[PDB]
Amino acid sequence: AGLPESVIWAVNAGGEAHVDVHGIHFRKDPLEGRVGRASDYGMKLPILRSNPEDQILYQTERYNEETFGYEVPIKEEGDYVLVLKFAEVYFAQSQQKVFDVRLNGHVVVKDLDIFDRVGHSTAHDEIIPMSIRKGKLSVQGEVSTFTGKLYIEFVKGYYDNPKVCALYIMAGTVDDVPKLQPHP
Numbered sequence: 471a472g473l474p475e476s477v478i479w480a481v482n483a484g485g486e487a488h489v490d491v492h493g494i495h496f497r498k499d500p501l502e503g504r505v506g507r508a509s510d511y512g513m514k515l516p517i518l519r520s521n522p523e524d525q526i527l528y529q530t531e532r533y534n535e536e537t538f539g540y541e542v543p544i545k546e547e548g549d550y551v552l553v554l555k556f557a558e559v560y561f562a563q564s565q566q567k568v569f570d571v572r573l574n575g576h577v578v579v580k581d582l583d584i585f586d587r588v589g590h591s592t593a594h595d596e597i598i599p600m601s602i603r604k605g606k607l608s609v610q611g612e613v614s615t616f617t618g619k620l621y622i623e624f625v626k627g628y629y630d631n632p633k634v635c636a637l638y639i640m641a642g643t644v645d646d647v648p649k650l651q652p653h654p
């Protein structure tokens with residue numbers, strides 16, 4: 471299946487519906503008024519590296535002072551890729567905001583420091599392949615029982631607050647995923 475048809479689930483965190491230049495529909499945030507805090511602070515800033523028609527994805531966020539996450543229903547077995555989109559719109563030094571990302575308890579991004587990787591007011595994406603087969607979730611060489619639901623968690627550590635800007639899941643493998651331009 472082509473790109474839009476292969477997307478099963480997609481969210482614009484802290485924001486409203488938006489269709490990107492590839493035809494992907496990022497839905498309005500399902501956690502509005504429920505878990506965490508929305509912020510549109512970045513809407514005053516140009517976002518580097520991103521396509522300019524799609525900056526609104528990175529200008530809006532959900533963050534929290536305690537651990538929080540999204541629950542995702544998955545209806546069929548197969549190969550999938552999770553894409554997570556971030557930007558740092560407040561700090562401009564390393565070791566100011568740092569946090570882990572977990573999937574069904576497996577640590578899939580350790581010590582994420584958005585500023586250290588890309589700078590201030592600049593797009594950064596994490597790309598995570600996975601497989602769901604024979605009643606099991608497989609990610610980064612680890613395996614556990616799958617019940618029908620994925621839980622995507624942003625973990626509170628010692629350095630400021632965990633956050634996310636947008637996220638989607640597509641059927642396929644990593645060679646099918648659009649990549650951000652080389653940044654440095």
Ligand SMILES: OC[C@H]1O[C@H](O[C@@H]2[C@@H](O)[C@@H](O)O[C@H](CO)[C@H]2O)[C@H](O)[C@@H](O)[C@@H]1O
Pocket residue numbers: 509510511533559560630631633
């Ligand atoms: O919405 C802007 C950012 O809010 C939070 O950061 C806080 C900042 O607004 C200010 O109050 O300073 C404190 C540090 O003392 C920051 O924690 C979010 O954590 C951040 O992700 C937002 O971009």
